[PDB]
């Protein structure tokens, strides 16, 4: 049984142009699905507007979905029931993008780490203190930091406090919303190391939301590529990074810089900017930019299909596999 499972998750925001016109749907996420396993990292990659930061908000119950199902260990996680409200907060936890805006400026670090225990658990004062000091030692902060305010810590130490806050309720899934993006090269390394260590020690699973494919390559076990709210390619780390088959992934990998001169085996160019979610293209979302455009691609929307373990949402790969078409 999968640890965490999502079937057809979607979110449509209704938007109004003005009093004079109809409402329309911004389809920010449109039918993603996955099976996160125990002690594994799932990487969600894509450029800004692809829906990755909505998937983080759905899975952490910051916002409710408009369809599909989210299961933890065979139990439904989208019911309103108070017994599911306990399971939600205890098992699934969040690490945010911005270290400067995700710790409360006026609360001491001890306060910030104890607040989750005080709200959900029954622990005593002394107990809560004990557990906060133990978590700081595990994450790499000294005992003397307990009574500091967040405005007297470096950006790396702020993501350390934010990770320590997530771990308090002993989570199974930690969802990391661009966690290393604001940090500089030595601090990224440090943080990454810490994360790996915690994974190896506590048996967490990560949902890694990022656009730094360099990092992804290093961290990820399973990778999912998104474009305009749909999954376009899914597979193993090795698979995608060594043998990419969706035209968008080929364009995205070859657009990342690589320090070693041998890595960039071909250079591919898109020659146009991103479609607005407010006015989606008629057919495949990448039809405006695609190197391989072909008759079906304006008329219909591709669907994920198995092509040797890899999942690819592309009619041209389908034809490469299926010549009869």
């Amino acid at each position: 049984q999968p640890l965490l499972q999502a079937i057809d998750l979607k979110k449509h925001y209704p938007v109004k142009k003005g009093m004079f016109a109809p409402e329309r749907l911004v389809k920010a996420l449109d039918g993603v699905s996955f099976n996160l396993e125990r002690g594994k990292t799932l990487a969600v990659v894509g450029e800004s507007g692809c829906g990755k930061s909505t998937l983080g908000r759905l899975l952490t119950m910051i916002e409710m979905p408009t369809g599909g199902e989210l299961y933890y260990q065979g139990q439904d996680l989208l019911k309103h029931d108070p017994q599911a409200q306990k399971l939600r907060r205890q098992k699934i936890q969040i690490v945010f993008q911005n270290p400067y805006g995700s710790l409360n400026p006026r609360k001491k670090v001890g306060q910030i780490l104890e607040e989750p225990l005080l709200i959900n658990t029954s622990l005593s004062k002394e107990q809560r203190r004990e557990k906060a000091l133990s978590m700081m030692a595990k994450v790499g902060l000294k005992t003397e930091h307990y009574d500091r305010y967040p405005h007297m810590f470096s950006g790396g130490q702020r993501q350390r406090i934010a990770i320590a806050r997530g771990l308090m309720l002993d989570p199974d899934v930690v969802i990391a919303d661009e966690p290393v993006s604001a940090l500089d090269v030595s601090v990224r390394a440090q943080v990454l190391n810490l994360m790996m260590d915690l994974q190896q020690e506590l048996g967490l699973s990560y949902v890694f939301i990022s656009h730094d494919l360099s990092v992804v390559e290093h961290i990820a076990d399973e990778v999912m590529v998104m474009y305009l709210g749909r999954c376009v390619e899914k597979g193993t780390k090795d698979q995608i990074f060594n043998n990419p088959r969706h035209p968008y992934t080929q364009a995205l990998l070859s657009a990342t810089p690589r320090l070693n001169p041998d890595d960039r085996r071909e250079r591919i160019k898109l020659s146009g900017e991103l479609p607005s979610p407010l006015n989606p293209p008629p057919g495949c979302a990448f039809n405006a930019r695609c190197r391989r455009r072909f008759g079906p691609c304006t008329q219909l929307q591709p669907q994920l299909k198995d092509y040797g373990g890899q999942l690819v949402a592309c009619f041209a790969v389908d034809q490469d596999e299926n010549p009869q078409r």
Partner: protein, 323 residues
């Protein structure tokens, strides 16, 4: 073209300055691409803002030599500095959204940049603006002139920035972290645009970035900065195959690219020195893996090596990565 010697930029009280740039020295040849790289405290951008004259009174600029196109910048009449800035040197800034004035149409902002340095004819200037927006790859150059900055995407806004910089046929261009606010497939287009303009106009280009992989493609010469000082300089192929300084070695071993699957990354222990904790001797001395007694007693010179590179270390690293 640009010749910098002993440039220093101090902020705050003269009893105890924040040495944001400290005795740096380098030069940019005509038609060269130079990368400046370093982590967040490094002072990389302050060195370029000081050439333009964008440093305000809390900061103080001093240099032994700051020659540009054979013209000294230290003692230049303001009029001449105006003449220079925007017509022989130009700059692209970090945030593409706030860098354009929100209250004027982009045609006004390009046609203004042309007016101060070239002819004033309204028709002529509109024609030059349509030519510039073709040259930076705007989809429909004629209709875009009547559009306000908040209607442009991040990528479109930075093309308009390059159109203002390139307007008067500049000779040096500085890109201060241009693409760091932008998506990967937009970054690849803006860097190819800068390198295409660089090759077509034969102009010099300075890239400021934290991303070592981006200058590894773009640059001919790379300068590395730590704590407001230059620490390694060399040709962009060799500087990342045999690093001559402990900081560039450490900064590379912290990159995922130089690591196997799921293996731990290296890092140096401790934070960058601020205004309060400047060590005596070498600034990397609290952090450096190879430190010895001399590194505390004496500041290392910017030594020049037999292969033509430069390293600010008493013991520059061998071809195998050891002192």
């Amino acid at each position: 073209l640009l010749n910098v010697d002993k440039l220093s930029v101090h902020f705050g009280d003269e009893s105890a300055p924040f040495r944001a740039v400290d005795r740096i020295s380098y030069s940019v040849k005509q038609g060269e691409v130079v990368g400046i790289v370093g982590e967040s405290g490094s002072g990389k951008s302050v060195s370029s803002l000081a050439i333009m004259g964008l440093i305000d009174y809390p900061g103080r600029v001093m240099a032994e030599k700051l020659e540009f196109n054979g013209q000294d910048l230290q003692r230049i009449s303001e009029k001449e500095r105006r003449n220079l800035v925007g017509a022989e040197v130009a700059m692209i800034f970090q945030d593409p959204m706030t860098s354009l004035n929100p209250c004027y149409t982009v045609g006004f902002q390009i046609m203004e940049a042309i007016k101060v340095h070239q002819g004033g004819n309204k028709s002529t200037r509109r024609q030059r603006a349509i030519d510039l927006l073709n040259q930076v790859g705007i989809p429909d150059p004629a209709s875009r002139l009547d559009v306000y900055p908040h209607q442009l995407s991040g990528g479109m806004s930075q093309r308009v920035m390059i159109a203002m910089a390139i307007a008067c046929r500049p000779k040096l261009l500085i890109a201060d972290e241009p693409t760091t606010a932008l998506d990967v497939t937009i970054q690849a287009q803006i860097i190819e645009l800068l390198l295409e303009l660089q090759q077509k106009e034969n102009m010099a280009l300075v890239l400021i970035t934290h991303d070592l992989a981006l200058v590894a493609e773009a640059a001919h010469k790379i300068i590395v900065m730590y704590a407001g000082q230059v620490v390694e300089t060399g040709d962009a192929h060799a500087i990342f195959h045999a690093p001559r300084h402990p900081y560039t070695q450490a900064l590379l071993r912290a990159l995922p690219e130089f690591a196997q699957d799921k293996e731990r990354l290296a890092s140096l222990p401790g934070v960058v020195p601020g205004k309060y904790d400047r060590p005596n001797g070498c600034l990397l001395n609290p952090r450096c893996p190879y430190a010895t007694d001399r590194c505390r007693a004496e500041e290392p010179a910017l030594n020049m090596l037999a292969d033509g590179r430069q390293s600010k270390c008493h013991y520059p690293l061998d071809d195998a990565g050891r002192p």
